[PDB]
């Protein structure tokens, strides 16, 4: 819910820079002189940053030295069909790069094989200034690394084009990592109205970070492999650690957590890693089930949570949920809702990006306007 | 697919015994392992099973509090210790696989073992 | 805990005879049943599951029908491959399975 915070950026600003930076007169000679011996060389721009600079495809020696001889010799006739199939390879990449470039305007969000092969990519991945552990990260997963990284078409001018792929970094590798789930948590009385609900919006990821904590409250915006959160540091808040204290307790002197109060009675359901929470209110029909043995839960009202064990479907009112079946352990923490904390006549009826100091507190102003009369 | 049993023989009554089943042809960590037993002549008694992660242990209740389970994923193996054996314990133990993988309800055996022979008269 | 009883405790019958055999619980099980055959001196075979579902590889000549507390498991055509011991079980909800007396079914004399 906390995904208004974050702050704007450029994101291709980097490589818009090495671009503005390729214009300058002699880059791209210096860049073809380099290339001139091998396909791969590092090159120190006139920015001052050294980057690794790849020859992806050579057409010009192919055509000069193997078409164009054998096509305008006498009369340009061909004797052979081989030619034709050979040229359209060679040139399948070319005009596929340049239609990816039309129609993403020249900036392409997801690097594809045509800009880039997989060889290539980890060519490129092996020779960068990064240590060894970033290496083996970046090359396991290629396809995180073409999800989260850019190709700016530069500049085409004296026989070459030239464009820059802006790949990832991964500075920060191998820090424990967590993310919370929130719900709805309401109170079960029967009255139609009456009845306060309160929810956590701190959900998304967390991760310790230089003494901090990296929070990413869009959660969609992190991807997720066996067990190794890929996000952006970009979309993200930084917090202190303390904040992981509002799982010890949630009533903590040091740290806030922020929260959301409403009055919507509303049956839901938040999947999460390894189980399943429930909310339901008010009607709803609310079921746990195993594909082979049918329903095995119901649901009474209140906040409840299951397992990902035996159970494979969660069903509330028309909405069916499938678990995720990935394996590990649950724990079932026992507690009393906070909920029943609160006086439903002294309750604040909304507010969006509130917290526990700031509700309790308003609690407060209610209760000295309703005691001094 | 094979499942190898060992550790039977003869015992007097009163003593303990330890079978074990090491499994091979399959994903073992991933499901569940039952033993179940046949008297001489007699139709097939279930015994015992254990999940796949091997957090859930359930007894029949004519050897509960004797008998106890345990697996090894690491060797892909089941043990079933028995002391305090009976004269109605003598009997041919089999180790099953069961049918359906990576869940917490236990629904039947589909690939069965040899078995070991345990035999408890004095 | 649940009762399990077949019917009959043996039965001999010539090759190619429909052969009809019966299982009954104490109580509901209402679909979760397990048939096996286990051949003379051989180890049990899973015939089939959920009371009807026919495992992979089994003859079609087994058929499983019934549900509640009853159930049935007919041979169409015997076959010699076919004598031994049939064993009902259930698996309903969180052992102990229960499995039956089992039923001997030979070839005529």
């Known amino acids: 819910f906390l995904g208004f915070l974050l702050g704007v950026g450029s994101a291709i600003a980097s490589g818009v820079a090495v671009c503005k930076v390729l214009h300058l007169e002699g880059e791209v000679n210096k860049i073809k002189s380099a290339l001139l011996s091998t396909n791969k060389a590092v090159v120190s721009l006139s920015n001052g940053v050294s980057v690794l600079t790849f020859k992806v495809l050579d057409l010009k020696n192919y055509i000069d030295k193997q078409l164009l001889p054998i096509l305008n010799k006498q009369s340009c006739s061909i004797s052979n069909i081989e030619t034709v199939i050979e040229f359209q390879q060679k040139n399948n990449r070319l005009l596929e790069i340049t239609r990816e470039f039309s129609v993403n305007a020249g900036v392409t969000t997801p690097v594809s094989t045509y800009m880039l092969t997989n060889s290539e990519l980890l060519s490129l991945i092996n020779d960068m200034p990064i240590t060894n552990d970033q290496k083996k990260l970046m090359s396991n997963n290629v396809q995180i690394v073409r999800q989260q990284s850019y190709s700016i078409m530069c500049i085409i001018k004296e026989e070459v084009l030239a464009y820059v792929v802006q790949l990832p970094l991964y500075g920060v590798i191998d820090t424990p990592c967590w993310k919370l789930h929130t719900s709805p948590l309401c109170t079960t009385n029967t009255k139609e109205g009456s009845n306060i609900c309160l929810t956590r919006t701190d959900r998304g990821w967390y991760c310790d970070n230089a003494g901090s904590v990296s929070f990413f409250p869009q959660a969609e915006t992190c991807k997720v492999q066996s067990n190794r959160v890929f996000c952006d540091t970009m979309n993200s808040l930084t917090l202190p650690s303390e904040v992981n204290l509002c799982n010890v307790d949630i009533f903590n002197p040091k740290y806030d957590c922020k929260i959301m109060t409403s009055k919507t009675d509303v049956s839901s359901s938040v999947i999460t890693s390894l189980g399943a929470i429930v909310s339901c209110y008010g009607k709803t029909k609310c079921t746990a089930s195993n594909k082979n043995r049918g329903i095995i839960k119901t649901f009474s009202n209140g906040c409840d949570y299951v397992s990902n064990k035996g159970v494979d479907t969660v069903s509330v009112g028309n909405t069916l949920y499938y678990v995720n079946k990935q394996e590990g352990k649950s724990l079932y923490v026992k507690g009393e809702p906070i909920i029943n904390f609160y006086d439903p006549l002294v309750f604040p009826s909304d507010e969006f990006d509130a917290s526990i100091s700031q509700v309790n507190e308003k609690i407060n102003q209610s209760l000295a306007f309703i005691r001094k009369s | 697919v094979q499942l190898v049993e060992s550790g039977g023989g003869v015992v007097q009554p009163g003593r303990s015994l330890r079978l074990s089943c090491a499994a091979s042809?399959?994903?073992?960590?991933?499901?569940?392992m039952h033993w179940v037993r046949q008297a001489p002549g007699k139709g097939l008694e279930w015994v015992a099973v254990?999940?796949?992660?091997?957090?859930?242990?359930y007894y029949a209740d004519s050897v509960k509090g004797r008998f106890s389970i345990s697996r090894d994923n690491s060797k892909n193996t089941v043990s079933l210790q028995m002391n305090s054996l009976r004269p109605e314990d003598t009997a041919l133990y089999y180790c099953?696989?069961?049918?359906?993988?990576?869940?917490?309800?236990?629904?039947?055996?589909?690939?069965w073992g040899q078995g070991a022979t345990v035999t408890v008269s004095s | 805990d649940i009762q399990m009883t077949q019917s009959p405790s043996s039965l001999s019958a010539s090759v190619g005879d429909r052969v009809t055999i019966t299982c009954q619980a104490s109580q509901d099980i209402k679909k979760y049943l397990n048939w096996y055959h286990q051949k003379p001196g051989k180890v049990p075979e899973l015939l089939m599951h959920d009371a009807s579902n026919l495992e992979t590889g089994v003859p079609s000549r087994f058929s499983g029908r019934g549900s509640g507390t009853d159930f049935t498991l007919t041979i169409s055509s015997l076959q010699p491959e076919d004598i031994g011991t049939y064993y009902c079980?259930?698996?309903?909800?969180?052992?102990?399975?229960?499995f039956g007396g089992g039923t001997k079914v030979e070839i005529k004399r």
């Open positions: 099953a696989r069961d049918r359906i993988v990576d869940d917490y309800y236990y629904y039947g055996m589909d690939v």
């Open positions: 254990i999940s796949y992660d091997g957090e859930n242990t």
């Open positions: 042809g399959f994903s073992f960590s991933h499901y569940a």
């Open positions: 079980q259930q698996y309903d909800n969180l052992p102990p399975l229960t």
